[PDB]
């Protein structure tokens, strides 16, 4: 069967990386009238991605024809799927022709296809490296129009190209986008922002006077922690690497950062998403059974990830560390409620239950309405997440929350929720166990009412490493 032959012949052609033979074979199928399928086209895109940019000659048939093949797939109304976009992008990156990468995205749009974020990169990054800001901004506007959300690398590129071309309005706008979508910035981006604020263009932008009432109302309107009305003040910036104290007071300038509210309506949307996601991956009846039990229990001030409390920094499950975490949560509860312990039934009945008094305590917590033993096969994470979200209470876990599951939750709401709800434990020799509570301010880029900026660097563990901030305040 001829399509099936081609499939095999291209699967074969090539794990060998034979582009010249993939291209001969492409042509042959078309001289034979064999209709190329989704799979055929993808293998062909991949294989052309193996080719390379000819520094010493006019470009090679492989990369060159790759775009031709991509163009042709879309003409043929073969639907792209995730591998199509990835291979399409690799091809774009290898060629390193931004204008040509942009064409692909334009063709996609023309034919009612949604480009992905990775489709835009080779275009955006190409123009930014070459210093072409106007093209970068076109790509940016196209991505906005298609509702494709940039991440930090795309914003950082846009920020640098705006700095390189002296465009203070675009720097401002991109800085706002970093605040809104990223919150805390990588070392890269942090250094770039510091350079911005020390730069001639920053020194020379600003206004000596402005409508305070208008800034005031913008702060209300924005949700807090920024205003978005432009650069304020004039003259040289005083730019310092610094730290916030535990109350969110900048140690450089003494400004007290804001604690930015979460709108309860976003919370109810996220709860609904959480239930839907969990019911897609859990056995639906298991998750529903927990939902129904939770409705009949509580109230709760805290939810514990019992597997994480038993295991974090331990060589095996420590009933001591779980139990001491339960007790400490109960002690900080104003009315001394026990926390809700989420734990696998295998643990309730196995590894932390070979000492009879510990088994009896686990059963006591259950009998107190303060323990739910999840069934075998379940991923506990959906359970303690849903419980903390639905009870609107503290969540006690040191889980990094970088598993694939957690990426399904998004990079706007969930990280803001996490900051306000997550309690983590730390242990010292001198003191034993401590609960580290949510900060009383928001760890995010902030712009004050007089135009002072505070920019937080992202870190792996802000209890392990002390978080550096930038303080940018006009010397005036
Ligand atoms: Sr877990
Ligand atoms: Zn400051």
């Amino acid at each position: 069967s001829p399509e099936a032959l081609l499939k095999q012949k291209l699967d074969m052609c090539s794990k060998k990386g034979d582009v010249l033979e993939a291209l001969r074979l492409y042509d042959e199928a078309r001289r034979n009238g064999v209709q190329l399928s989704q799979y055929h086209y993808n293998v062909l895109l991949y294989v052309c991605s193996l080719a390379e940019a000819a520094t010493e000659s006019s470009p090679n048939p492989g990369l060159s024809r790759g775009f031709d093949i991509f163009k042709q797939m879309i003409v043929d109304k073969v639907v792209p799927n995730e591998a199509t976009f990835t291979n399409g992008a690799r091809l774009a990156v290898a060629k390193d022709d931004p204008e040509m990468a942009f064409d692909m995205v334009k063709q996609m749009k023309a034919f009612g296809i949604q480009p992905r974020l990775r489709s835009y990169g080779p275009a955006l990054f190409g123009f930014c490296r070459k210093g072409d800001a106007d093209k970068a901004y076109e790509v940016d506007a196209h991505m906005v129009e298609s509702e494709v959300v940039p991440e930090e690398p795309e914003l950082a590129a846009l920020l640098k190209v705006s700095m390189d071309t002296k465009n203070a309005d675009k720097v401002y706008k991109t800085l706002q986008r970093l605040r809104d979508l990223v919150r805390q910035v990588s070392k890269s981006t942090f250094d770039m922002i510091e350079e911005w604020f020390k730069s001639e263009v920053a020194t020379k932008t600003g206004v000596k006077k402005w409508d305070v009432k208008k800034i005031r109302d913008a702060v209300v309107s924005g949700g807090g922690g920024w205003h978005g009305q432009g650069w304020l003040g004039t003259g040289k910036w005083n730019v310092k690497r610094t730290e916030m104290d535990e109350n969110g007071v900048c140690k450089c300038c003494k400004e007290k950062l804001v604690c930015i509210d979460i709108n309860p309506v976003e919370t109810e949307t996220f709860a609904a998403s959480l239930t839907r996601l969990a019911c897609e991956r859990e056995v639906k009846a298991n998750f529903n059974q927990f939902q129904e039990w939770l409705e009949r229990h509580g109230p709760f001030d805290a939810v514990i990830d019992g597997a994480n409390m038993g295991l974090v920094n331990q060589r095996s499950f420590s009933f001591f560390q779980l139990n001491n975490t339960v007790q400490r949560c109960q002690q900080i509860s104003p009315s001394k409620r026990l926390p809700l312990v989420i734990l696998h039934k295998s643990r309730v009945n196995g590894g932390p239950a070979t000492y009879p008094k510990n088994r009896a305590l686990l059963e006591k917590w259950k009998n107190a309405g303060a323990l739910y033993a999840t069934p075998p096969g379940s991923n506990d994470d959906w359970y303690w997440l849903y419980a903390a979200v639905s009870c609107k209470c503290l969540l006690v876990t040191n889980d990094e929350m970088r598993d694939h599951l957690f990426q399904l939750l998004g990079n706007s709401f969930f990280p803001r929720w996490k900051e306000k709800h997550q309690v983590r434990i730390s242990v010292t020799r001198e003191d034993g166990l401590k609960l580290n509570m949510p900060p009383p301010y928001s760890i995010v880029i902030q712009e004050s009412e007089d135009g002072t900026w505070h920019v937080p660097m992202s870190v792996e563990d802000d209890l392990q490493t002390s978080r550096q901030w930038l303080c940018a305040k006009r010397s005036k």
Side-chain angles (χ1 to χ4, degrees), residues 70 99-113 115 120 127 135 138-139 142:
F70 171 80
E99 196 60 64
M100 283 195 86
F102 198 11
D103 288 328
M104 290 175 72
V105 164
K106 290 162 156 170
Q107 297 166 332
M108 281 179 209
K109 178 173 182 62
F111 286 70
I113 294 167
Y120 281 103
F127 294 132
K135 295 292 197 159
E138 291 188 33
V139 178
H142 200 283

Coordinates of all heavy atoms in Angstrom, one line a residue, residues 70 99-113 115 120 127 135 138-139 142:
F70 N 6.4 23.0 4.0 CA 5.5 23.5 5.0 C 4.4 24.3 4.4 O 3.2 24.0 4.6 CB 6.2 24.4 6.0 CG 5.3 25.1 6.9 CD1 4.8 24.5 8.0 CD2 4.9 26.4 6.7 CE1 3.9 25.1 8.9 CE2 4.0 27.1 7.5 CZ 3.5 26.4 8.6
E99 N 12.4 37.0 8.8 CA 11.3 37.3 7.9 C 10.6 36.1 7.4 O 9.4 36.1 7.2 CB 11.9 38.2 6.7 CG 10.7 38.9 5.9 CD 9.9 39.9 6.8 OE1 10.5 40.9 7.3 OE2 8.7 39.7 7.0
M100 N 11.4 35.0 7.2 CA 10.8 33.7 6.7 C 10.1 33.0 7.8 O 9.0 32.4 7.5 CB 11.9 32.9 6.1 CG 12.3 33.4 4.7 SD 13.4 32.0 3.7 CE 11.9 30.9 3.0
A101 N 10.6 33.0 9.0 CA 9.8 32.5 10.1 C 8.5 33.2 10.2 O 7.4 32.6 10.4 CB 10.6 32.6 11.4
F102 N 8.5 34.5 10.1 CA 7.3 35.3 10.2 C 6.3 34.9 9.1 O 5.0 34.8 9.4 CB 7.6 36.8 10.2 CG 6.6 37.7 10.7 CD1 5.4 37.3 11.4 CD2 6.7 39.1 10.5 CE1 4.5 38.2 11.8 CE2 5.8 40.0 11.0 CZ 4.7 39.5 11.6
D103 N 6.8 34.6 7.9 CA 5.9 34.2 6.8 C 5.1 33.0 7.2 O 3.9 33.0 6.9 CB 6.7 34.0 5.5 CG 7.2 35.3 4.9 OD1 6.5 36.3 5.0 OD2 8.3 35.3 4.3
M104 N 5.7 32.0 7.8 CA 5.1 30.8 8.2 C 3.9 31.1 9.1 O 2.8 30.6 8.9 CB 6.0 29.8 8.9 CG 7.1 29.2 8.1 SD 8.3 28.1 9.2 CE 7.1 26.5 9.6
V105 N 4.2 31.9 10.1 CA 3.1 32.3 11.0 C 2.0 33.1 10.3 O 0.8 32.8 10.5 CB 3.7 33.2 12.2 CG1 2.5 33.9 12.9 CG2 4.4 32.3 13.1
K106 N 2.3 34.0 9.4 CA 1.4 34.7 8.6 C 0.5 33.7 7.7 O -0.7 33.8 7.6 CB 2.0 35.7 7.6 CG 2.6 36.9 8.3 CD 3.6 37.6 7.5 CE 3.7 39.1 7.9 NZ 4.8 39.8 7.3
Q107 N 1.1 32.6 7.1 CA 0.4 31.6 6.3 C -0.6 30.9 7.2 O -1.7 30.6 6.8 CB 1.4 30.7 5.7 CG 2.4 31.3 4.7 CD 3.5 30.3 4.3 OE1 3.9 29.4 5.1 NE2 4.1 30.5 3.1
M108 N -0.1 30.4 8.3 CA -0.9 29.8 9.3 C -2.2 30.5 9.6 O -3.3 29.8 9.6 CB -0.1 29.6 10.6 CG 0.9 28.5 10.6 SD 1.8 28.5 12.3 CE 3.5 27.7 11.8
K109 N -2.2 31.8 9.9 CA -3.3 32.7 10.2 C -4.2 32.8 9.0 O -5.3 32.5 9.1 CB -2.7 34.1 10.5 CG -3.9 35.1 10.7 CD -3.4 36.5 11.2 CE -4.6 37.4 11.5 NZ -5.5 36.9 12.6
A110 N -3.6 33.1 7.8 CA -4.3 33.1 6.6 C -5.3 31.9 6.4 O -6.4 32.1 5.9 CB -3.4 33.2 5.4
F111 N -4.8 30.7 6.8 CA -5.6 29.5 6.7 C -6.3 29.0 7.9 O -6.7 27.9 8.0 CB -4.6 28.4 6.2 CG -4.2 28.5 4.8 CD1 -3.4 29.5 4.3 CD2 -4.7 27.5 3.8 CE1 -3.0 29.6 3.0 CE2 -4.4 27.7 2.5 CZ -3.5 28.7 2.1
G112 N -6.6 30.0 8.9 CA -7.4 29.7 10.0 C -6.7 28.7 11.0 O -7.4 28.0 11.8
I113 N -5.4 28.7 11.1 CA -4.6 27.9 12.0 C -4.1 28.7 13.1 O -3.6 29.8 12.8 CB -3.5 27.2 11.3 CG1 -4.1 26.2 10.3 CG2 -2.6 26.5 12.3 CD1 -3.1 25.7 9.3
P115 N -1.3 29.8 15.5 CA 0.1 29.5 15.7 C 0.4 29.3 17.2 O -0.4 29.7 18.1 CB 0.8 30.8 15.3 CG -0.2 31.6 14.6 CD -1.6 31.2 15.1
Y120 N 6.3 31.6 17.0 CA 6.7 33.0 17.0 C 8.1 33.3 17.3 O 8.7 34.2 16.9 CB 5.8 33.7 17.9 CG 4.4 34.0 17.4 CD1 3.3 33.3 17.8 CD2 4.2 35.1 16.5 CE1 2.0 33.6 17.3 CE2 2.9 35.4 16.0 CZ 1.9 34.6 16.4 OH 0.6 35.0 15.9
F127 N 14.5 39.0 14.7 CA 14.5 40.5 14.5 C 15.2 41.2 15.7 O 15.9 42.2 15.5 CB 13.1 41.0 14.4 CG 12.3 40.6 13.2 CD1 11.0 40.1 13.2 CD2 12.9 40.8 11.9 CE1 10.3 39.7 12.1 CE2 12.2 40.5 10.7 CZ 10.9 39.9 10.8
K135 N 10.1 45.5 13.3 CA 9.7 44.2 13.0 C 9.4 43.3 14.2 O 8.3 42.6 14.3 CB 10.8 43.5 12.2 CG 11.0 44.1 10.8 CD 9.8 43.9 9.9 CE 10.2 44.2 8.4 NZ 9.3 43.6 7.5
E138 N 6.0 44.2 15.2 CA 5.0 43.6 14.3 C 4.7 42.2 14.7 O 3.6 41.8 14.8 CB 5.5 43.5 12.9 CG 5.7 44.8 12.2 CD 6.0 44.6 10.7 OE1 5.5 43.6 10.1 OE2 6.7 45.4 10.1
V139 N 5.8 41.5 15.0 CA 5.6 40.1 15.4 C 4.8 40.1 16.7 O 3.9 39.3 16.9 CB 7.0 39.4 15.6 CG1 6.8 38.0 16.1 CG2 7.7 39.3 14.3
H142 N 1.2 40.7 16.2 CA 0.6 39.5 15.6 C 0.3 38.5 16.6 O -0.8 37.9 16.7 CB 1.5 39.0 14.6 CG 0.8 38.1 13.5 ND1 0.5 36.9 13.8 CD2 0.5 38.4 12.2 CE1 -0.1 36.3 12.7 NE2 -0.1 37.3 11.8

